Amino acid sequence: EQRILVIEDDHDIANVLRMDLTDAGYVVDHADSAMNGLIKAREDHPDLILLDLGLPDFDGGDVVQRLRKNSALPIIVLTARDTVEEKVRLLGLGADDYLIKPFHPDELLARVKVQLRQRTSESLSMGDLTLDPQKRLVTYKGEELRLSPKEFDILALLIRQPGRVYSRQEIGQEIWQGRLPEGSNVVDVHMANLRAKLRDLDGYGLLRTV
């Protein structure tokens, strides 16, 4: 049974989400505040996080960012702002997917299912870089590496076809499966983070320091 953390300050909505998700065979835990959410996210070992917006956006964005902070956990954000800008903001800040309010319980079960679907291939490799597309685990130079789900999926996409160069639109379409509006910076921002977590500093010698 997969576990879901619901971070929702509106208690009526939290209850409805609990009923609906529980009825689908998920174990559900509730956090009534951004702070309780951060704490449970780090301790309860959830398989997925649902986050419904209620703060000003400096805080709200910070929350998404903090939950995203070196975490492999998928995050879905509920928003009432039905705009291209909002979708680009959330995916850019590290949400794996958004859901526009108001919505039907089935729209929710569907997005949730996408995020929690069973793995695929075996461990991928390229030199001493290894990805296990199941534990969503990756190691490089012996050192285990913490990628977000989208970082992981992008790295996997590149490694499966090493000689291939994908266009921004190609990666956007493949990785977010239609959910990311075109023309944005989201792919670039994810690449920049991938380079930072992976790219080797210049210099190679027999002795190499890190």
TrEMBL record:
Domain OmpR/PhoB-type: 121-210
Record-level GO cellular component terms: cytosol; protein-DNA complex
Region forming the signal peptide: none
Localisation per UniProt entry: Cytoplasm
Sequence positions bearing 4-aspartylphosphate: D52
Keyword presence, Transferase: no
UniProt keywords, alphabetically: Cytoplasm, DNA-binding, Phosphoprotein, Transcription, Transcription regulation, Two-component regulatory system
Record-annotated Response regulatory domain positions: 3-116
DNA-binding region(s), residue ranges: 121-210
GO term, biological process aspect, one: positive regulation of DNA-templated transcription
Molecular function terms from GO: cis-regulatory region sequence-specific DNA binding; identical protein binding; phosphorelay response regulator activity; transcription cis-regulatory region binding
Protein name (Swiss-Prot/TrEMBL): DNA-binding response regulator
Organism: Deinococcus radiodurans (strain ATCC 13939 / DSM 20539 / JCM 16871 / CCUG 27074 / LMG 4051 / NBRC 15346 / NCIMB 9279 / VKM B-1422 / R1)
